[PDB]
Symmetry: C3
Subunit: 101 residues, 3 copies
Amino acid sequence: PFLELDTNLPANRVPAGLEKRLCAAAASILGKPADRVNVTVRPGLAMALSGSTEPCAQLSISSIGVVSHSAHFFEFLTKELALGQDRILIRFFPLESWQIG
Amino acid sequence: PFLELDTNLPANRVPAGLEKRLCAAAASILGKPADRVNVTVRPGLAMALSGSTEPCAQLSISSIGVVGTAEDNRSHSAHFFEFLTKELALGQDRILIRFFPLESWQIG
Amino acid sequence: PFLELDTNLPANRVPAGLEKRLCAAAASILGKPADRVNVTVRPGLAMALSGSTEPCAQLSISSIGGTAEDNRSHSAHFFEFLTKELALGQDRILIRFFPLESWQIG
Ligand code: NA
């Protein structure tokens, strides 16, 4: 699976190793080995979420086929980033094997 | 709606409050309430657009039910071009827009 | 075509002009005029790839309008380009292909 996290938290305000712990959490939540989970974190962006520029984060999850998981990812992200659930949005994307290189 | 804007303009050359004004613009253009509009701006990137590295921007727009036909998208893009060329001081030829329909189940 | 490259290499360690050379390389590999090739490079990110945070890169390729043989050859040549330019092992690079139709282009 591929996880992409955009956030407007400055890079020097994000917990060190977030990408590694999010990788481990997604492995458990999605039932996959950690070495098949890929995580990309992009901090320091300019973001409006639900029309507000308050601190927020967007998570995208892509996997083969169609994939609550949302509840578990909210749990982890609220704890790591101190963001309320109202400041986080999650999207899921299906892939087909021909798209993998 | 979800709007994602990549640009090679430095952050200091992106006008303050752009993400908020693009929010209101997208709500009017797409016919969605502002509290459902999400904007992500990623400045300072390294970009080539149409083979040139001069200042440029790429905008991606994703939404349920509204960006699924050429007739719909031609109408939306005209309004988004007029807004971005004014805000970013870029020529129309330096901006590319892509539309992605979302299916309802994809929202977590 | 649209190429987007995410990497956790700090911007200062990405070779200068990478986006120009990737543009030219992609035109040759994908068989498209260079003026139809768009490249976006996002460096300095935080990434875990195959469970490791060692330097890595992800390349996404979207084209308007492949065979298994075609995309297999494209992937191999993009691996060759990225390992040379970024000094990464092949195990530190992932590639994804995405479909696009003309009605999606403004
Ligand atoms: Na539609």
